[PDB]
Amino acid sequence: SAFTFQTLHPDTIMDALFEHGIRVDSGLTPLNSYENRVYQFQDEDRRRFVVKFYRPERWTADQILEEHQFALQLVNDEVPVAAPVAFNGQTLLNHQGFYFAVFPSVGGRQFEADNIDQMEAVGRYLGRMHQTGRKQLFIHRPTIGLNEYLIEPRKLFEDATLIPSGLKAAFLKATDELIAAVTAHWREDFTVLRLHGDCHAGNILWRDGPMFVDLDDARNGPAVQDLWMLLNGDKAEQRMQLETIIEAYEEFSEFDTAEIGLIEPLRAMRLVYYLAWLMRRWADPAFPKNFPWLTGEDYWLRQTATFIEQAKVLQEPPLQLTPMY
């Protein structure tokens, strides 16, 4: 289940870009992305580009093709995303034992989740995105559910090694308790469609309009998935943002208010999966280089408490007085 990190020299990359007539220009300067290896490069006219080498063992060609399609179609319906460039046939090039694609370096500033106006513009395009995304469902890419997000990680956690011994028990207990709670609130009672899959401020840029970047995680799931991670602030601030992005979102796609109940389970889901995600990629130098703590107890104690806390959010607090408003 754990990846066997295979290095990729910047030279082996130039060969790849050569084998496909992709004339570079000057230097193959690297950008930082944990999942896949991305490098930027100008063209004979100095118009910036980026090569993305999909990390082996993660996605299959049939899966990368599905997003390449999605991205390409999304462009057709006028949604702020950069589709991969085509090279005399397809978009999914492959040099040596690595697949890769080239995308038009987008550029732009940092999206401000603060500005309620940008929120609306993002919520609105997100509505046109899901409008497209609903036309058909991935067949090879995952479709968000408990298997990949909960049960698989728990299995890794078992034979982890990276979890401090005797502290693991409590942790695995807090986990089980969490997956029981999320499972009890999960439901196949919602609409599924092609999602951005990782829609949060980080993967959104702004140059007079929002621009979504990185569909590597595009998965089949509930519309809410691309909306809950946007909220920020105090309870009341999030009450209006949610209320606001839906009013804009609904211009192109109706939103099912009931999906708002799936948020705590999704957050719980992203929480437990993220631990396996890091763990599985541990042989990659970059992960012990940035997540050094992953090894200490402090971290696994805090995590244990975070899980225990999440299950309480998923259950009615025995307040009882029942103060309305």
Swiss-Prot record:
GO biological process: response to stress
Enzyme class: transferase
Result of altering S33A: Partial loss of kinase activity, only partially protects bacteria against hyperlethal stress
Site for ATP, residues: S33
Residues bound to Mg(2+): N203, D214
Active-site residue numbers: D198, D214
SUPFAM superfamilies reported in the protein's UniProt record: Protein kinase-like (PK-like) (SSF56112)
InterPro entries named among the record's database cross-references: Aminoglycoside_PTrfase (IPR002575), Kinase-like_dom_sf (IPR011009), SrkA/RdoA (IPR032882)
Subunit structure as annotated in this protein's UniProt entry: Monomer.
Protein name: Stress response kinase A
Origin species: Escherichia coli (strain K12)
Gene field: srkA
